[PDB]
């Protein structure tokens, strides 16, 4: 009854809607309702995962992130 | 009754809609309702996973991310 | 009753619609409803997975990502 | 009662529609409803998977991704 | 009661429509409803899978992806 | 009045005996004289030479050298 | 009046004997004279030479050297 | 009147014997004379040479040297 | 009247014997004379040479040297 | 009238014998004379040389040296 993780890199999100506008819900009229319920949003993220190494060992890594989305004249 | 992970790299998301506008739900009228329920959204993400190595070992990696989506005049 | 993963790289998402506008749901009228329910969306993502290696070992990798989608004058 | 994966690289998504506009659902009238339910969408993604190697070993890989979809004047 | 994979590379998606506009569903009138239910969409994705190798071993690979779909004046 | 080399791999040796036991040399008597004068002796040597390459490019090579000459009981 | 080298890998040695036991040399008697005059002796040596490369590029190489000459009972 | 080298890897030695037991040299009698005059002796030496590279680039190399010459019972 | 070197790796030695037991040299009798005059002796030496690189770049290398010559019972 | 070096790694030694037991040298009798005159002797030496790099850059290297020559019972 347990979990073991080593050098594991993962991204995610757990969420349960359950009822949500249910179970004896008249509702009738609803306007533009925008809610953020769970979800995994990651951008420009770097990570490094390594196991066990014996003897001489060296790790080298380089990353770069400049700008992403650009909106023109509207 | 457990899970073991080593040098594993994965991206995902778990979500349950369940009822959602159900179970005795009249609804009647609903406007543009936009909600984010679960989902995996990753962009410009780098990662490194390695196992066990014996003796001399070296790791080298390089990544670059500049701009992505561009919107013209609307 | 368990799972074992080593140097595994996968991307996905688990989601259950369940009822969703069901189970005693009149509905009647519904406007443009856009909701994000589960899904795997990954762009510009790099990863490296290796097993166990004995003796001298070296890993080299390079990736580049510049721009992607471009929208012209509308 | 378990699963074992080593150096496995796969992309996918699991989703269940279930009822969805069913089970005592009048519906009547429905507008342009667009929802994202499960699905695997990956673009510009690179990955490397290797097994166990004995003795001297070297891995070299290079990938490049510039632009993709372009929209002209509308 | 388990599955074993080694150096396996596959892309796919599992989804169940189930009822979907069924099971006591009047429907009556439905507008242009576009929903993404399951599916495998991968473009510009590269991967490498190798088994176990004894003695000296080297792996070299190179891929390139520039532009894809282009829309002219409409 | 010059030389140009690019990605050239060669092994050799330049030596001039000139006089050597000459030019007014009585000599008379000479014992087992063993001298090493110039010569190219290379064993277990590896090298890689490449020219100019445009676009994505990858190089992979592996060599091994274990034992060579063995002398039995004398 | 010059030399240009790029990514060139060569092994050699320059030596001039000139006179050596010459030019008014009686000598008379000479015992086992062993002298090392110039010469190229390289064993278990590895090297890598590459030119100019444009765009993504990766280099991978692996070499091993264990034992060489073995003398038995004399 | 000059020399230019770039990413060049070479091993050698320059030596001039000149007279050496010459030019009015009686000598008469000479015992086992052993002298080391110039020469290139390199064993278990590794080196890496690369030119100019544009864009993402990665270099990976691994070498090993254990034992070489072995003398048995004499 | 000059020399230019960039990322150049070489091993050697310059020596001039000149006269050496010459030029009005009776000598008469000489015992086992052993002198070290110039010469290049390098063992278990590693080096790395790289040129100019633009953009992301990574270098990885690993070397090992254990024991070499072994003398048995004499 | 000058020399320019950048990221250059070399090992050597300059020595001139000149006269040495010459120029009006009777000598007559000489015992086992052992003198060290110039020469390059390097063992277990590592070095790293790199040029100019623009943007993100990482360098990783690892070396090991244990024991070398072993003398048995004499």
Write a compact overview of the structure shown:
Chains A, B, C, D, E, F, G, H, I, J: Its main location: cytoplasm. Ten copies of one chain form a homodecamer. The first copy, chain A, has strands spanning 2-6, 9-11, 14-16, 29-30, 36-37, 40-43, 46-49, 53-54, 57-66, 70-71.
Describe this structure in words.
The structure is a homodecamer of 74-residue chains. Helices cover 0% and strands 50% of the residues of chain A. By secondary structure, chain A is mainly β. At the A-B interface, β1, β2, β3, β4 and β5 of A face β1, β2, β3, β4 and β5 of B. Chains A, B, C, D, E, F, G, H, I, J: It is found in: Cytoplasm; Membrane; Nucleus; Synapse. Chains A, B, C, D, E, F, G, H, I, J: This is Alpha-synuclein. Chains A, B, C, D, E, F, G, H, I, J: Sequence repeats lie at residues 2-12, 13-27, 28-38.
Structural class of chain A: mainly beta
How many strands, what sense, and barrel or not for the largest sheet of chain A?
A: none
- How many helices of chain A in DSSP terms? 0
Order of helices and strands of chain A: EEEEEEEEEE
The share of residues in extended strands of chain A comes to over 45%
Q: Roughly how many Å is the radius of gyration of chain A? A: 22 Å
Biggest interface reads: A-B, 74 and 74 residues
Q: What is the oligomeric state here?
A: homodecamer
Per the principal axes of the C-alpha atoms, what is the gross shape of chain A?
flat
- Through-space gap between termini of chain A: 56 Å
How many beta strands in the DSSP annotation of chain A? Answer: 10
GO cellular component, one term (chains A, B, C, D, E, F, G, H, I, J): protein-containing complex
GO biological process, one term (chains A, B, C, D, E, F, G, H, I, J): synaptic vesicle endocytosis
Keywords (chains A, B, C, D, E, F, G, H, I, J): Acetylation, Alzheimer disease, Amyloid, Cell projection, Copper, Cytoplasm, Disease variant, Membrane, Metal-binding, Neurodegeneration, Nucleus, Parkinson disease, Parkinsonism, Phosphoprotein, Repeat, Secreted, Synapse, Ubl conjugation
Family (chains A, B, C, D, E, F, G, H, I, J): Belongs to the synuclein family.
């Amino acid at each position: 009854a347990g979990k073991t993780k080593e050098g594991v890199l993962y991204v995610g999100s757990k969420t349960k809607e359950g009822v949500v506008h249910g179970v004896a819900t008249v509702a009738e009229k609803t306007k533009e309702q925008v809610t953020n319920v769970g979800g995994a949003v990651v951008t420009g993220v770097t990570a490094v995962a390594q196991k066990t190494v014996e003897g001489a060992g060296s790790i080298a890594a380089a990353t770069g992130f400049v700008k992403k989305d650009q909106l023109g004249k509207n």
